[PDB]
Amino acid sequence: GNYRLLKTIGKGAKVKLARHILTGKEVAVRIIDKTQLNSSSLQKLFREVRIMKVLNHPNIVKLFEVIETEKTLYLVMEYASGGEVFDYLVAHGRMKEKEARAKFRQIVSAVQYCHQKFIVHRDLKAENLLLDADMNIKIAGSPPYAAPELFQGKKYDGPEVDVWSLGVILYTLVSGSLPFDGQNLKELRERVLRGKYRIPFYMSTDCENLLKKFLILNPSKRGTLEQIMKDRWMNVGHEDDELKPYVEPLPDYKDPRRTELMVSMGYTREEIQDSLVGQRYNEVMATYLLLGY
Amino acid sequence: PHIGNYRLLKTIGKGAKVKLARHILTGKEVAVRIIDKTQLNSSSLQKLFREVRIMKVLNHPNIVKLFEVIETEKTLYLVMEYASGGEVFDYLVAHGRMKEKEARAKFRQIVSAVQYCHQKFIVHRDLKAENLLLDADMNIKIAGSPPYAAPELFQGKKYDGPEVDVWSLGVILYTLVSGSLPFDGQNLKELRERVLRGKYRIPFYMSTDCENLLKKFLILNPSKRGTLEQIMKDRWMNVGHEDDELKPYVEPLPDYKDPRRTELMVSMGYTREEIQDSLVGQRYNEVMATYLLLGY
């Protein structure tokens, strides 16, 4: 629709770099063929959509428009033009702790924001953490991140799962490698269940102390992130601004500047209003959003 | 571009490297695996050595043959069978599912090969299809891991037995005939929930024979699973082999005295003496390699 599709940036669903016509703005459009999706995967797709709609945090990709046809679902979102953090590491060794922290602060914020809404990512990879033009985290190979309880036939519901995973993340962020590894599953399981991981000589005690806060075998012995947020390593170099849960900014559905512009385009205030209050994510809403730059 | 007796040709796998090469004195093609041991951490070294001990012993037309080991302090070299036709994985993604007649052909070799390993109390412990290669003649050669895991993994159960391999083989069959995995998910929890339940989708075109055989592999309770030797008697396995049933593989006795080759080797300047010693020795030095490679 409304969007001039530029190149492809992910295949086989496809993902297309596009420019929103009326605003000139760049968006990634995810194009999904529902007809190919088996029963179970469709539920997951729908669940995923419901979640995007509601997430609004600077470090989680923003959803801009959903366009639905019988065969195809299109998702228009924020383009992360910085690649994956995965790459960045393989590119540029380990991160120095100053930089790991910078990134890791945003990650922890994002996930904790999710948590505020009783949403569990349930599957943090680093195939999952993107970066934008300015090296900011944007959130959108899975085994090493699995929590113990997985391998134990334990329930796998909580936020505590995410916390564990973040532990893993931190470690690879600062070590350039996974804490728990193996040439296979049995081994990775024996290694994860033991919980012991190699401390690199260059690690700060502060860092190791924070690692301990995440990677705790017993699930319901794990900090909330809101606690973790108070951790000392997290807040080095922020002596005056400590990490706190992110607070959503208040809805602004009435910006006269854009409403103006949109009337110019032929939208009625009426609908602009309806679409936002509605959180419909129709073209009216996309347009309002994209004029938000 | 040298090492022992091998002209290294192209690279065929990176980041250890694996180089197609031509054994000079015989003209034969071999895949050389070059490993930098300095880079291997403690644990990984044990697994390498363990892996080497095993190769040296395996001798089955559908497991890659080990030809030579060349050890240096930093670098270990493993010279072996080159399977030119790539992975079965690929072949499927290339040419839909296999029809049963063909699934069976391949799957016979696979089950033979694993069972041969079992005779030797060796458990592959990690059958992928990233693991099953094909040679020039579409024969299986044995050398993405999660969907193959047996239940007991996710349950904290011990994970030692042959029974592990059997389950995996179940998975293999299924993908071999369906062109896809019996147990899937967008993630671990789901793949676990799916594997623990055991239920998998039956495709409309599947024979009842086939599904009967699948049931024989994929049984939740580990110590309720056939040996492969039982499985080998299965009806589906043996359709189209009414007169030759799959039985455990019997490897043929050693011949360290092939006059034809010993000859040619003397010609090259090896002493019978040493040819003899290397083989009895199961040294896997250049003398042995050459003997082996002359066996084509």
PDB file of N, CA and C in Angstrom, chain A residues 227-291:
ATOM      1  N   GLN A 227      14.727  -4.844  41.031  1.00  0.00           N
ATOM      2  CA  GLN A 227      15.803  -4.933  41.973  1.00  0.00           C
ATOM      3  C   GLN A 227      17.067  -4.811  41.198  1.00  0.00           C
ATOM      4  N   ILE A 228      17.365  -5.781  40.359  1.00  0.00           N
ATOM      5  CA  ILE A 228      18.576  -5.710  39.576  1.00  0.00           C
ATOM      6  C   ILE A 228      18.916  -4.264  39.127  1.00  0.00           C
ATOM      7  N   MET A 229      17.915  -3.472  38.796  1.00  0.00           N
ATOM      8  CA  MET A 229      18.148  -2.115  38.336  1.00  0.00           C
ATOM      9  C   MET A 229      18.919  -1.240  39.302  1.00  0.00           C
ATOM     10  N   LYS A 230      18.756  -1.507  40.591  1.00  0.00           N
ATOM     11  CA  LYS A 230      19.488  -0.847  41.646  1.00  0.00           C
ATOM     12  C   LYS A 230      20.923  -1.354  41.748  1.00  0.00           C
ATOM     13  N   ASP A 231      21.303  -2.419  41.058  1.00  0.00           N
ATOM     14  CA  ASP A 231      22.647  -2.967  41.212  1.00  0.00           C
ATOM     15  C   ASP A 231      23.705  -1.935  40.914  1.00  0.00           C
ATOM     16  N   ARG A 232      24.820  -2.085  41.625  1.00  0.00           N
ATOM     17  CA  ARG A 232      25.938  -1.163  41.565  1.00  0.00           C
ATOM     18  C   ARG A 232      26.601  -1.155  40.207  1.00  0.00           C
ATOM     19  N   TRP A 233      26.867  -2.313  39.608  1.00  0.00           N
ATOM     20  CA  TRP A 233      27.507  -2.310  38.287  1.00  0.00           C
ATOM     21  C   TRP A 233      26.636  -1.597  37.307  1.00  0.00           C
ATOM     22  N   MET A 234      25.331  -1.835  37.380  1.00  0.00           N
ATOM     23  CA  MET A 234      24.416  -1.234  36.421  1.00  0.00           C
ATOM     24  C   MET A 234      24.562   0.269  36.474  1.00  0.00           C
ATOM     25  N   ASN A 235      24.835   0.803  37.670  1.00  0.00           N
ATOM     26  CA  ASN A 235      24.813   2.259  37.849  1.00  0.00           C
ATOM     27  C   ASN A 235      26.125   3.003  37.975  1.00  0.00           C
ATOM     28  N   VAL A 236      27.241   2.307  37.783  1.00  0.00           N
ATOM     29  CA  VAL A 236      28.533   2.975  37.628  1.00  0.00           C
ATOM     30  C   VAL A 236      28.494   3.971  36.477  1.00  0.00           C
ATOM     31  N   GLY A 237      29.004   5.154  36.733  1.00  0.00           N
ATOM     32  CA  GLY A 237      28.947   6.167  35.709  1.00  0.00           C
ATOM     33  C   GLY A 237      27.571   6.792  35.586  1.00  0.00           C
ATOM     34  N   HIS A 238      26.654   6.421  36.483  1.00  0.00           N
ATOM     35  CA  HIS A 238      25.365   7.108  36.592  1.00  0.00           C
ATOM     36  C   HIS A 238      25.085   7.530  38.019  1.00  0.00           C
ATOM     37  N   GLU A 239      26.174   7.795  38.756  1.00  0.00           N
ATOM     38  CA  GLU A 239      26.112   8.253  40.157  1.00  0.00           C
ATOM     39  C   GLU A 239      24.846   9.165  40.344  1.00  0.00           C
ATOM     40  N   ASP A 240      24.465   9.967  39.350  1.00  0.00           N
ATOM     41  CA  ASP A 240      23.273  10.789  39.588  1.00  0.00           C
ATOM     42  C   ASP A 240      21.921  10.420  38.988  1.00  0.00           C
ATOM     43  N   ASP A 241      21.918   9.402  38.167  1.00  0.00           N
ATOM     44  CA  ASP A 241      20.680   9.010  37.592  1.00  0.00           C
ATOM     45  C   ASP A 241      20.736   7.490  37.607  1.00  0.00           C
ATOM     46  N   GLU A 242      19.967   6.878  38.501  1.00  0.00           N
ATOM     47  CA  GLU A 242      20.094   5.434  38.720  1.00  0.00           C
ATOM     48  C   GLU A 242      19.081   4.848  37.797  1.00  0.00           C
ATOM     49  N   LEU A 243      19.209   3.596  37.346  1.00  0.00           N
ATOM     50  CA  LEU A 243      18.158   3.019  36.471  1.00  0.00           C
ATOM     51  C   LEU A 243      16.871   2.762  37.228  1.00  0.00           C
ATOM     52  N   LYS A 244      15.727   3.220  36.710  1.00  0.00           N
ATOM     53  CA  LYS A 244      14.453   2.936  37.377  1.00  0.00           C
ATOM     54  C   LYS A 244      13.566   2.337  36.329  1.00  0.00           C
ATOM     55  N   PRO A 245      12.503   1.589  36.690  1.00  0.00           N
ATOM     56  CA  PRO A 245      11.548   1.192  35.648  1.00  0.00           C
ATOM     57  C   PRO A 245      11.196   2.343  34.725  1.00  0.00           C
ATOM     58  N   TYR A 246      11.069   2.046  33.417  1.00  0.00           N
ATOM     59  CA  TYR A 246      10.736   3.066  32.413  1.00  0.00           C
ATOM     60  C   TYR A 246       9.333   3.436  32.700  1.00  0.00           C
ATOM     61  N   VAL A 247       9.016   4.719  32.542  1.00  0.00           N
ATOM     62  CA  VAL A 247       7.638   5.187  32.659  1.00  0.00           C
ATOM     63  C   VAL A 247       7.115   5.614  31.314  1.00  0.00           C
ATOM     64  N   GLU A 248       6.044   4.987  30.886  1.00  0.00           N
ATOM     65  CA  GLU A 248       5.422   5.366  29.626  1.00  0.00           C
ATOM     66  C   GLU A 248       5.062   6.888  29.520  1.00  0.00           C
ATOM     67  N   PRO A 249       5.392   7.557  28.395  1.00  0.00           N
ATOM     68  CA  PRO A 249       4.873   8.956  28.363  1.00  0.00           C
ATOM     69  C   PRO A 249       3.358   8.955  28.000  1.00  0.00           C
ATOM     70  N   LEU A 250       2.653   9.972  28.464  1.00  0.00           N
ATOM     71  CA  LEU A 250       1.195  10.000  28.351  1.00  0.00           C
ATOM     72  C   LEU A 250       0.717  10.093  26.936  1.00  0.00           C
ATOM     73  N   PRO A 251      -0.369   9.434  26.632  1.00  0.00           N
ATOM     74  CA  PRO A 251      -0.855   9.528  25.271  1.00  0.00           C
ATOM     75  C   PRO A 251      -0.977  10.982  24.780  1.00  0.00           C
ATOM     76  N   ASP A 252      -0.547  11.282  23.557  1.00  0.00           N
ATOM     77  CA  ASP A 252      -0.815  12.600  22.971  1.00  0.00           C
ATOM     78  C   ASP A 252      -1.475  12.401  21.631  1.00  0.00           C
ATOM     79  N   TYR A 253      -2.812  12.356  21.602  1.00  0.00           N
ATOM     80  CA  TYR A 253      -3.568  12.111  20.361  1.00  0.00           C
ATOM     81  C   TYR A 253      -4.055  13.378  19.635  1.00  0.00           C
ATOM     82  N   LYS A 254      -3.577  14.544  20.090  1.00  0.00           N
ATOM     83  CA  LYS A 254      -4.170  15.836  19.773  1.00  0.00           C
ATOM     84  C   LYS A 254      -3.129  16.856  19.361  1.00  0.00           C
ATOM     85  N   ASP A 255      -1.965  16.394  18.947  1.00  0.00           N
ATOM     86  CA  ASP A 255      -0.943  17.338  18.595  1.00  0.00           C
ATOM     87  C   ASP A 255      -1.472  18.143  17.441  1.00  0.00           C
ATOM     88  N   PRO A 256      -1.757  19.416  17.698  1.00  0.00           N
ATOM     89  CA  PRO A 256      -2.368  20.250  16.673  1.00  0.00           C
ATOM     90  C   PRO A 256      -1.500  20.370  15.398  1.00  0.00           C
ATOM     91  N   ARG A 257      -0.177  20.321  15.563  1.00  0.00           N
ATOM     92  CA  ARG A 257       0.735  20.411  14.438  1.00  0.00           C
ATOM     93  C   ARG A 257       0.402  19.343  13.368  1.00  0.00           C
ATOM     94  N   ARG A 258       0.261  18.104  13.816  1.00  0.00           N
ATOM     95  CA  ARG A 258       0.137  16.990  12.913  1.00  0.00           C
ATOM     96  C   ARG A 258      -1.287  16.834  12.511  1.00  0.00           C
ATOM     97  N   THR A 259      -2.192  17.092  13.444  1.00  0.00           N
ATOM     98  CA  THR A 259      -3.595  16.976  13.147  1.00  0.00           C
ATOM     99  C   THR A 259      -3.902  17.908  12.001  1.00  0.00           C
ATOM    100  N   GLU A 260      -3.374  19.126  12.117  1.00  0.00           N
ATOM    101  CA  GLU A 260      -3.333  20.052  11.009  1.00  0.00           C
ATOM    102  C   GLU A 260      -3.012  19.391   9.705  1.00  0.00           C
ATOM    103  N   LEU A 261      -1.775  18.920   9.651  1.00  0.00           N
ATOM    104  CA  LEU A 261      -1.218  18.326   8.469  1.00  0.00           C
ATOM    105  C   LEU A 261      -2.106  17.231   7.924  1.00  0.00           C
ATOM    106  N   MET A 262      -2.590  16.409   8.827  1.00  0.00           N
ATOM    107  CA  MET A 262      -3.450  15.335   8.424  1.00  0.00           C
ATOM    108  C   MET A 262      -4.813  15.801   7.881  1.00  0.00           C
ATOM    109  N   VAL A 263      -5.336  16.896   8.420  1.00  0.00           N
ATOM    110  CA  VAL A 263      -6.545  17.457   7.841  1.00  0.00           C
ATOM    111  C   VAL A 263      -6.243  17.856   6.404  1.00  0.00           C
ATOM    112  N   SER A 264      -5.087  18.499   6.216  1.00  0.00           N
ATOM    113  CA  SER A 264      -4.588  18.888   4.898  1.00  0.00           C
ATOM    114  C   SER A 264      -4.630  17.744   3.928  1.00  0.00           C
ATOM    115  N   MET A 265      -4.283  16.562   4.422  1.00  0.00           N
ATOM    116  CA  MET A 265      -4.257  15.362   3.596  1.00  0.00           C
ATOM    117  C   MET A 265      -5.641  14.803   3.316  1.00  0.00           C
ATOM    118  N   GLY A 266      -6.616  15.271   4.099  1.00  0.00           N
ATOM    119  CA  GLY A 266      -8.024  14.880   3.953  1.00  0.00           C
ATOM    120  C   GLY A 266      -8.564  13.960   5.043  1.00  0.00           C
ATOM    121  N   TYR A 267      -7.779  13.746   6.085  1.00  0.00           N
ATOM    122  CA  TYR A 267      -8.301  13.032   7.214  1.00  0.00           C
ATOM    123  C   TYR A 267      -9.153  13.960   8.094  1.00  0.00           C
ATOM    124  N   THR A 268     -10.205  13.418   8.695  1.00  0.00           N
ATOM    125  CA  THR A 268     -11.055  14.182   9.599  1.00  0.00           C
ATOM    126  C   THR A 268     -10.537  13.963  11.006  1.00  0.00           C
ATOM    127  N   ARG A 269     -10.673  14.979  11.864  1.00  0.00           N
ATOM    128  CA  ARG A 269     -10.105  14.937  13.219  1.00  0.00           C
ATOM    129  C   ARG A 269     -10.693  13.752  13.916  1.00  0.00           C
ATOM    130  N   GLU A 270     -12.014  13.782  13.939  1.00  0.00           N
ATOM    131  CA  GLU A 270     -12.878  12.640  14.008  1.00  0.00           C
ATOM    132  C   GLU A 270     -12.172  11.294  13.937  1.00  0.00           C
ATOM    133  N   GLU A 271     -11.666  10.946  12.758  1.00  0.00           N
ATOM    134  CA  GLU A 271     -11.084   9.639  12.591  1.00  0.00           C
ATOM    135  C   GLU A 271      -9.710   9.584  13.218  1.00  0.00           C
ATOM    136  N   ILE A 272      -8.898  10.604  12.986  1.00  0.00           N
ATOM    137  CA  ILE A 272      -7.570  10.616  13.581  1.00  0.00           C
ATOM    138  C   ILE A 272      -7.695  10.226  15.030  1.00  0.00           C
ATOM    139  N   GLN A 273      -8.658  10.898  15.678  1.00  0.00           N
ATOM    140  CA  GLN A 273      -9.037  10.683  17.067  1.00  0.00           C
ATOM    141  C   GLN A 273      -9.452   9.239  17.276  1.00  0.00           C
ATOM    142  N   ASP A 274     -10.380   8.767  16.436  1.00  0.00           N
ATOM    143  CA  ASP A 274     -10.898   7.427  16.636  1.00  0.00           C
ATOM    144  C   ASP A 274      -9.757   6.434  16.565  1.00  0.00           C
ATOM    145  N   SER A 275      -8.941   6.538  15.522  1.00  0.00           N
ATOM    146  CA  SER A 275      -7.883   5.569  15.238  1.00  0.00           C
ATOM    147  C   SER A 275      -6.856   5.483  16.355  1.00  0.00           C
ATOM    148  N   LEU A 276      -6.632   6.595  17.035  1.00  0.00           N
ATOM    149  CA  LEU A 276      -5.631   6.551  18.097  1.00  0.00           C
ATOM    150  C   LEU A 276      -6.196   6.045  19.376  1.00  0.00           C
ATOM    151  N   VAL A 277      -7.343   6.553  19.744  1.00  0.00           N
ATOM    152  CA  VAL A 277      -7.976   6.105  20.949  1.00  0.00           C
ATOM    153  C   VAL A 277      -8.172   4.612  20.771  1.00  0.00           C
ATOM    154  N   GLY A 278      -8.544   4.269  19.551  1.00  0.00           N
ATOM    155  CA  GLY A 278      -8.794   2.911  19.177  1.00  0.00           C
ATOM    156  C   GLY A 278      -7.539   2.096  19.159  1.00  0.00           C
ATOM    157  N   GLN A 279      -6.400   2.721  18.913  1.00  0.00           N
ATOM    158  CA  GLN A 279      -5.163   1.995  18.768  1.00  0.00           C
ATOM    159  C   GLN A 279      -5.354   1.018  17.667  1.00  0.00           C
ATOM    160  N   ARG A 280      -5.944   1.505  16.575  1.00  0.00           N
ATOM    161  CA  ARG A 280      -6.313   0.664  15.437  1.00  0.00           C
ATOM    162  C   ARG A 280      -5.123   0.349  14.590  1.00  0.00           C
ATOM    163  N   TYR A 281      -4.111   1.189  14.572  1.00  0.00           N
ATOM    164  CA  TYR A 281      -2.948   0.912  13.714  1.00  0.00           C
ATOM    165  C   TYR A 281      -3.340   0.797  12.247  1.00  0.00           C
ATOM    166  N   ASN A 282      -4.390   1.517  11.876  1.00  0.00           N
ATOM    167  CA  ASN A 282      -4.735   1.719  10.475  1.00  0.00           C
ATOM    168  C   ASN A 282      -3.801   2.794   9.896  1.00  0.00           C
ATOM    169  N   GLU A 283      -3.972   3.120   8.611  1.00  0.00           N
ATOM    170  CA  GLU A 283      -3.150   4.136   7.954  1.00  0.00           C
ATOM    171  C   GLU A 283      -3.283   5.527   8.595  1.00  0.00           C
ATOM    172  N   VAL A 284      -4.459   5.869   9.052  1.00  0.00           N
ATOM    173  CA  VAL A 284      -4.531   7.107   9.772  1.00  0.00           C
ATOM    174  C   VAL A 284      -3.524   7.098  10.889  1.00  0.00           C
ATOM    175  N   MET A 285      -3.550   6.070  11.732  1.00  0.00           N
ATOM    176  CA  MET A 285      -2.599   6.000  12.876  1.00  0.00           C
ATOM    177  C   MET A 285      -1.113   5.976  12.444  1.00  0.00           C
ATOM    178  N   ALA A 286      -0.766   5.102  11.512  1.00  0.00           N
ATOM    179  CA  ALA A 286       0.566   5.085  10.979  1.00  0.00           C
ATOM    180  C   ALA A 286       0.949   6.490  10.594  1.00  0.00           C
ATOM    181  N   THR A 287       0.101   7.150   9.822  1.00  0.00           N
ATOM    182  CA  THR A 287       0.486   8.465   9.334  1.00  0.00           C
ATOM    183  C   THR A 287       0.768   9.428  10.507  1.00  0.00           C
ATOM    184  N   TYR A 288      -0.022   9.335  11.561  1.00  0.00           N
ATOM    185  CA  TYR A 288       0.108  10.233  12.677  1.00  0.00           C
ATOM    186  C   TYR A 288       1.406  10.011  13.366  1.00  0.00           C
ATOM    187  N   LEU A 289       1.640   8.742  13.680  1.00  0.00           N
ATOM    188  CA  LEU A 289       2.918   8.231  14.170  1.00  0.00           C
ATOM    189  C   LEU A 289       4.132   8.640  13.359  1.00  0.00           C
ATOM    190  N   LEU A 290       4.081   8.474  12.060  1.00  0.00           N
ATOM    191  CA  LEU A 290       5.270   8.744  11.274  1.00  0.00           C
ATOM    192  C   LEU A 290       5.568  10.221  11.118  1.00  0.00           C
ATOM    193  N   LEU A 291       4.523  11.019  11.260  1.00  0.00           N
ATOM    194  CA  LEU A 291       4.682  12.433  11.312  1.00  0.00           C
ATOM    195  C   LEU A 291       5.249  12.737  12.663  1.00  0.00           C
TER     196      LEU A 291
END
